[PDB]
Amino acid sequence: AVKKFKPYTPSRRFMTVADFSEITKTEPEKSLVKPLKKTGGRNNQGRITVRFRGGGHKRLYRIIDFKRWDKVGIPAKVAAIEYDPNRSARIALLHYVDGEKRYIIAPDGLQVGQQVVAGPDAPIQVGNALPLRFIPVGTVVHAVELEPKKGAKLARAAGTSAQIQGREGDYVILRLPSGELRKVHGECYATVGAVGNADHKNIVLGKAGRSRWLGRRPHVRGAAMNPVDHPHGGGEGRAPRGRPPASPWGWQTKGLKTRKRRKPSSRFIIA
Template identity: 35%
Template sequence: MSALSRSVNTARSLPRSTLASTSRLSIRNYATPSSVKNDGQQMMFGGPPPKRKEDGAVLKTYTGKGYPFIPSLRHVVYPYHPHLHKGGPLRELTIPLRRKGGRNNTGRIVNRHIGGGHKRRLRMVDFHRVQGGQHDVIRIEYDPGRSAHIALIKKRTSTSSTSGKSLTPNLIEEIEEALSEENRNTPKSLEAVKAGFSYIVAPEGLRKGDVVISYRKGIPQSLINEFDNTSSSSSEESKLSNNLEDDKVGATDTPEMRRALGLLRTITLKSGNVLPLFLIPPGTQVHNLSLTTDGKMQLCRSAGTFAQIVSHQSETGKSIGGSDVLTMGGGFDENGNRLPKKGYVLVKMQSGEVRKLDPGCVATIGVVSNKEHQSRSLGKAGRSRWLGKRPHVRGVAMNAVDHPHGGGRGKQKGNKHPRSIYGLLQHVRTRRPKDKDGNKSVVTERPRGKQTAAKH
């Protein structure tokens, strides 16, 4: 006991710093440092976060440090695109939007839930793309009148200041300065507009400085000399086959023609280019499809939408492949005369509907930009009012004098069939359909209702 008491007294007499140092030393002797280095863990906890690509879209929220904690910003989610133009549009390519609040010429409301909103100007977008040649992309802009982005393009001509060459960054800055708000309605701005500016729907991935070409009038003879899809058959081929018509393309499914077609598709199949459907291979994603040979492009124009080329078929329904697609016709010749079509092209929409279109109809290569549009959240009712949308009121919440579902006690509509505010029953046609047997161009209708797996 005397030895134990002496050791305890000795430990009590030591200073606290000595005890702390000895305890740390004892712990370090038992610890075994790891020789494996985890660079990912060091980057996650100790190093800076990985850099984001400035080119892609970011779903931006307005909460956290630097933002006020208020209800109007709590649920807001907006896609942020760094490549968009920060200024306004080219005013010479816009027209004012006159609002009528959903009323007709007599002042009656014919379109409900419309009214108010921020003042806008309509952008005049080119949905025909008839002008051929190379067009340089000046900038990508936001359009309040549509969900997709638009691109300001300029035709490259020999008479312009570009002299047929690609636009340099300095030249693009000079053009943007001429189109700025400060130089509006000045000779400098008007001269820039006359140089061939226009707006198009921007496909995904299109950026400032890119080049887009429209082949709606046909493939230029200078691009490829093996064949010309708008001219008549050559004299040598007419000697070999006297049955060829004058307006038929002199092309056969030979290895040489297949290589020529592959070369043509390699050059022309780029995002933003316009091509006739018979030159686009199956499986290609396209947008801005025209329903007629000389009409404007009407299908797949919203943000993130696209269609897919399924196959090329003859008049008898037989699939066409290789360079035989050049004999489908359907376009225009050099004199502007329509060539007879010999088949059609099957196109599948995102809804699952399959349509058959003329081979001379055109489409733009790629997917429509701003696919993040569906991920946005307005966050409050006021932003809907800024967009020109008025509130929707349920019929059961109204009085009996205002709606067929109104009145009564409790949340019920009196065992009535669903109908509109004007008394029209739901799912009942109010007009005779234009086509008695349905749309003739629809091969397979889109799936409707709940889809179940097939039982084997």
Template identity: 35%
Template sequence: MALPKLFANLTITTNLISRRAINVCAINFASKPSLIKPKPGFGIAYRRIVHFPEEYTVKPLNVTNLAGRDPVSGRLVAKGIGGGIKHKYHWIAWLRDGPKEGPPIEEKVIQVMEDGCRTAHIALIGVGDKLKYILATENMKAGDILKSSRVLPRIPVRANEGDAYVLGALPIGTLVHCIEKEPGYGGLYIHAAGTFGTILRKNNDRIIVQMPSKRLFSFDQHCMAVVGRLSNVEHGSTPIGSPQRNRWLGNRPRSGLWKRKDGRHGRKIKPPKPIKEISFAGKKGQNAIQLTMCP
């Protein structure tokens, strides 16, 4: 008679536990807002937010590090981002404009410096009473004079490193970067350290440029481009050197995937295999033939 009572008590307790679990789940579900986790990509960066003022300035801008989280919901979107040294952002003037007729304008390089928010070095240049930042070329140094012009001459110009001209004014084989997508919209292509594009040929009013990815792009001949290769050429071949420096760069480690001796890509210590005997199976000799006089 004790067994039915025991089963009855068990059913009562299980019902209470299930009701309590349903209650807790309902409360948790009701307290959390219905958020849709965003996906990385689509032109949205989850590394930092730069607080841009209304007008252009060379003053270093404040930055809010996101560490891979969505700025609205706070949910983790990009797992590989995190940590990193705090940097100030230097606003690059992507539009290298010049006169459409007459001599080119001249700008002087005041200082070449590193920028923590991009791979290539930047240069502070001035013309008149205006200052602006541009991407520095490989051999650019303080005191250089840069020229900018939108004139499309009949004969190609002989440009120096750092000068900005329209693509139709440059000879075939010129190394360029910061190429405009449309005339007057500012340099959009080729910003990474040590990269460059090459002018291959001219097709009527179109200029064929080989990009760093070896793909061929066709641009309008009136699109501006800066001559030369971008600075910090050794960036891609420089080893990180230590896990701590990787954290300084803002890269979050993929924790738990690697262990030295028994991890996924680690060195496995296994017992040696048994001795394998190597033997040569030679040809067996033929049996001796005995000859007799008897039939």
């Protein structure tokens, strides 16, 4: 839905925020070895190596389960659906019959009360994980793994998802969120359903700050700087690049493909 505001103050006549009803029934994290001190920091060993990051509200890190073959067959009830500052997606706190509690990136549709489980035996329904091989071609899934046992790495952003296009050998063909067609091993797990909280792509930040609360500091334009700072910089009084559009490091930034050519990763791609 997204909450909109009356225009009492500008920057807030455009501002809009998430429908937090989805979450509710729980704001406090499941402390139980669930959150960890999370180190902030826009740089590595001294130098900033990603520009314009910093500041941004204090943040606790919820550790979530991205490889569910741990508890194969051990079912669990969905305790709650909480808020995660560290992601676009919302998480779900799930108590296992085992007694062990874990977190999972909350799929769309999942509800407090439902039961869930991962395994080959597992029934094909929202929240359940299984190797792609045992998932019916056509079903939508999220939190897909890339190589087996390596853990989930695909379709985890709010409202994202992958769809099975069909098997072919030990591999199964997935159409990824981006839209690329990749062959992924059949043993790679993946939980059924879409990522959920798809209204996300619609929230309008609103003001200059807030972009700040999210830890994103101002991004200054190339042309605005000087010959020294960027290739675009310079020229007496406003100019048009004057070079084919380029990054501060000098590589062309409009259309120039960048992924490695001889990458073995290919052969399993097509899109």
